[PDB]
Write a protein that binds this ligand. Structure first.
Ligand SMILES: [Zn+2]
Lengths: 101, 410, 106, 78, 223
């Protein structure tokens, strides 16, 4: 159906060199409601991807089912962090571009 | 008797013996890489394993941990390979079965020992995890197969050989350092210009025992390898080879004499000269050849024994005692690692009292001793007595008061 | 289960030595129910029939050095990913998701 | 575990009412239900040191079903 | 695909539901406004494209051949806290772990033994530890009777109360049964866990939040 892809890239070896694998392996996007926030605008779904060094970047999808893929994988038991992040997102750590599709 | 079912059980036992060794190799593949590296110096036709995988103790991807233990696993693998070939050689050379199964069918018992026992007795006795060996090699130890100086096929004991060489020389001018240098020759050096004569009665009696001990140490070091095949190859190489060749001295005889030409060297054995030497010194020459082959096989072990002897000679007394203690701790270890005083006077606490019912437990003061009779482990004491916890059982502090229990009067 | 195991081995030997076990159940029952697929013993009966067929195929000998090579071949032929998933589940809970900074919208 | 930590009650089911319930179901040799230096009240959540480990298990199993001071009493092995 | 999802028809009955579908073999109406009718044959099971929105006691009942309107027995008890319903705890009593206690809980919900959880109350409820009820004799956890008598032994403790909606046989296990809303591994070895509510876990959480300050009683219950 309809899909929304946000490609967020990190710095080109600028601030990531400052480093002992402290939860480096990956950014994940969670679908958070806007009814509770640090909260003037509500009734909105945001695919927010938060990293350890990098701050959270959110893509606002007003659809309730915006690329909500169900049964995409062939019975893969990888819970990771979130179901939508495990199904419709990628963690390109080599090009520092964690995409949230 | 069911011969086809026995052959099927023998094939299942052979598959289980292969799988139990596969599980042991997946648990620690360093022993297989070490055995392949040891057999590469003996048989050249066999293919070698990967060097990086043998260094990291891995088979395909998973690196296994480091595992006395290698010698015990090699002995258990040799016992499993002896059991597998015996079960292979045992098997190398319907309606009536179903009707006889109904006889004595009213049996309240469990029968699940058909094929699981062959895997259970060969899986690498122990309750959960106490020994890396199987049930067939649970009593196997390297102490009855190796000395304290060797430390589970890691070194060699040359001090007894040095003392035997000094006794054969009948003097005290032979030190520890000279024997390892003199025994380094044993291809034609030890037959013509050795440290001792080739036909001496004092030297050869110690030399045959030293060659037998070196062959036994080599068999203990390569018990996982094909010892019979290595002995057959060493006999076939000596039968094929004329091995000692010179530019002018041509071929010598192990007689201790050379020949002018190869035509004379072949005809010398048919005369009366070399035939008496071959009839009276075949065992001494065979022992010298076996000692040279064992020294060539375990020349790294001989160099390790020489380095340990040099370290013990150049160390101090405390350093040598610490090295002997470390060698003994390595040899004798398992394969797999795992208030005032007026209170003390005027309270009865100056005299201590023990109660036999509570495991003869001693308490200070008479108050705690008479307070044993209402306790927890002392109540287990009356439970061991069999008398119930009553006032009459409380009134006695000894074990013999249980004969006047509730099952005494009524 | 010794009588049942012996009857199943006899039925497997009669099958692998393919109509005797079917003829015996038709001629006579509850004792010849091991050939049916409703019970859970059908896979064990098929494995025993395959073992009997492999025994009767070589009826030769095995001359397996070679046994150690076969053991190494059977040895040669998850946790890091589970630890990374646990670390990601800890990090997603420890990172504040309420600080949403909008860069794009869809 | 010689003591059964019995709690799930209120101040009405105190250390003494726990001793009364011990005299009912399974006896307590001692009571460890101490309080603070400012309050000084038995909350009832205390280690009733029973007659034995089996007596503490009997407090944990049989005596941990009372509605002690309105709340369901629960004793655990300690 | 022979079962229907007929909704829009509590005043209906099984005879009134099966009179329009008659050759219906199974007709089990749920406690909500839903029912499922299943025919044994193939030509008679196509009632969704043949008699949809049929009049059932002056009310249209649309029939769709699906499972949208909705082994281990499931004790489906509408556990009501006070005079209002706290949710329909459809506690799937684990017959694979403890079959005797699971059958006791299913029979206590179905009320086929004359007494059970249909109408009884839970008078031993703790916050996220246990909620014990099902005793229809003394109504405090000190009465109750199992199928073997007043007191019966636990079947098996293979299951554990590792989450919300996990049901255990409370005590030695008679008619007393305990629902757990959290981890209860300290009470393991004495109470045999015999359930896991995949449905009605929110009802078990509401019963644990209400527990007793309120009369938490399942007046309506069944299998
Ligand atoms: Zn005593």
């Amino acid at each position: 159906r309809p899909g929304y892809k946000v490609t967020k890239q990190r710095d080109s070896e600028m601030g990531q060199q400052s480093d002992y694998p402290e939860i480096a392996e990956m950014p994940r996007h969670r679908f958070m409601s806007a009814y509770e926030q640090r909260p003037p605008d509500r009734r909105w779904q945001y695919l927010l991807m938060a990293a350890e060094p990098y701050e959270t970047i959110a893509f606002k999808v007003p659809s309730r089912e915006i690329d909500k893929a169900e049964g995409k994988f062939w019975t893969h038991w990888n819970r990771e962090t979130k179901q939508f992040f495990l199904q419709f997102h990628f963690k390109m750590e080599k090009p520092p571009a964690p995409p949230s599709l | 008797e069911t011969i086809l079912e026995q052959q099927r059980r023998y094939h299942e036992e052979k598959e289980r013996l292969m799988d139990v060794m596969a599980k042991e190799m997946l648990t620690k593949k360093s022993t297989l890489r070490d055995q392949i590296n040891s057999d590469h110096r003996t048989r050249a036709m066999q293919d070698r394993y990967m060097e990086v995988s043998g260094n990291l103790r891995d088979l395909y991807d998973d690196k296994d941990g480091l595992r006395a233990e290698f010698y015990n696993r090699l002995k258990q693998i040799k016992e499993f390979h002896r059991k597998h070939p015996n079960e292979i050689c045992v098997p190398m050379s319907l309606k009536a079965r179903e009707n006889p199964s109904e006889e004595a069918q009213n049996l309240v018992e469990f029968t699940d020992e058909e094929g699981y026992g062959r895997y259970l007795d060969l899986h690498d006795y122990i309750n959960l995890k106490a020994s890396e060996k199987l049930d067939y090699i649970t009593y196997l130890s390297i102490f009855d197969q190796l000395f304290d100086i060797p430390k589970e096929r890691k070194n060699a004991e040359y001090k007894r050989y040095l003392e035997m060489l000094l006794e054969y020389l009948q003097d005290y001018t032979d030190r520890v350092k000279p024997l390892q240098d003199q025994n380094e020759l044993f291809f034609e050096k030890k037959w013509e210009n050795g440290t001792f004569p080739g036909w001496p009665k004092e030297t050869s009696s110690a030399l045959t025992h030293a060659g037998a001990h070196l062959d036994l140490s080599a068999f203990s070091s390569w018990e996982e390898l094909a010892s019979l095949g290595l002995d057959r190859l060493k006999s076939a190489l000596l039968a094929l080879g004329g091995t000692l060749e010179e530019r002018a001295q041509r071929l010598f005889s192990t007689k201790s004499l050379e020949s002018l030409d190869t035509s004379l060297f072949a005809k010398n054995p048919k005369s009366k000269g070399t035939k008496r030497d071959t009839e009276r010194n075949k065992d001494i020459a065979f022992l010298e050849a076996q000692i040279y082959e064992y020294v060539e096989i375990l020349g790294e072990q001989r160099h390790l024994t020489h380095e340990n002897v040099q370290r013990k000679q150049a160390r101090t007394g405390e350093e040598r005692e610490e090295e002997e203690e470390e060698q003994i701790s390595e040899s004798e270890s398992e394969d797999e690692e795992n208030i005032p005083y007026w209170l003390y006077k005027l309270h009865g606490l100056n005299i201590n009292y023990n109660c036999e019912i509570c495991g003869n437990y001693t308490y200070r003061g008479p108050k705690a001793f008479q307070r044993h009779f209402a306790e927890w482990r002392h109540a287990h004491g009356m439970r061991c007595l069999g008398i119930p916890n009553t006032a009459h059982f409380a009134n006695v502090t000894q074990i013999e008061d249980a004969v006047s229990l509730w099952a005494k009067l009524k | 289960s010794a009588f049942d195991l012996d009857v199943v081995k006899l039925t497997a030997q009669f099958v692998a030595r393919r109509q005797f076990l079917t003829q015996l159940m038709q001629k006579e029952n509850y004792q010849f129910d091991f050939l049916r697929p409703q019970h859970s013993l059908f896979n064990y009966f098929t494995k025993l029939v395959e073992q009997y067929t492999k025994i009767l195929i070589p009826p030769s000998k095995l001359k397996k050095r070679e046994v150690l090579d076969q053991v190494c071949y059977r040895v040669e032929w998850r946790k890091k990913e589970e630890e990374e998933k646990e670390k990601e589940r800890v990090a997603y809970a420890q990172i504040d998701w309420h600080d949403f900074v909008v860069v794009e919208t869809v | 575990d010689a003591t059964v930590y019995v709690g799930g009650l209120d101040e009405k089911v105190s250390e003494p009412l726990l001793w009364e319930l011990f005299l009912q179901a399974g006896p307590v040799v001692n009571t460890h239900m101490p309080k603070d230096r400012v309050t000084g009240q038995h909350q009832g959540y205390g280690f009733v040191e029973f007659l034995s480990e089996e007596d503490a298990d009997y407090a944990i199993k049989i005596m941990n079903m009372i509605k002690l001071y309105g709340k369901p009493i629960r004793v655990n092995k300690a | 695909k022979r079962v229907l999802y007929v909704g829009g028809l509590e005043e209906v009955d099984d005879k009134v539901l099966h009179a329009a579908f008659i050759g219906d073999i199974t007709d089990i109406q749920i406690p909500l406004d839903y029912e499922t009718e299943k025919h044994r044959g193939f030509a008679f099971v196509e009632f969704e494209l043949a008699e949809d929105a049929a009049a059932a006691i002056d009310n249209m009942n649309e029939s769709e051949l699906f499972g949208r309107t909705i082994s281990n027995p499931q004790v489906y008890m509408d556990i009501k806290i006070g005079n209002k319903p706290a949710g329909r705890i459809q506690m799937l009593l684990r017959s694979d772990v403890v079959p005797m206690t699971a059958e006791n809980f299913r029979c206590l919900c179905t009320h086929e033994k004359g007494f059970g959880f249909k109408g009884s109350s839970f008078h031993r409820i703790i916050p996220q530890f246990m909620c014990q009820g099902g005793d229809f004799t003394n109504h405090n956890g000190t009465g109750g009777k199992s199928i073997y008598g007043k007191k019966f032994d636990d079947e098996n403790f293979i299951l554990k109360h590792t989450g919300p909606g996990l049901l255990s046989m409370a005590n030695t296990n008679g008619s007393q049964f305990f629902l757990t809303c959290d981890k209860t591994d300290w009470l393991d070895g004495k109470h045999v866990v015999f359930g896991e509510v995949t449905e009605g876990l929110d009802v078990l959480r509401q019963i644990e939040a209400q527990g007793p300050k309120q009369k938490v009683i399942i007046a309506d219950c069944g299998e």
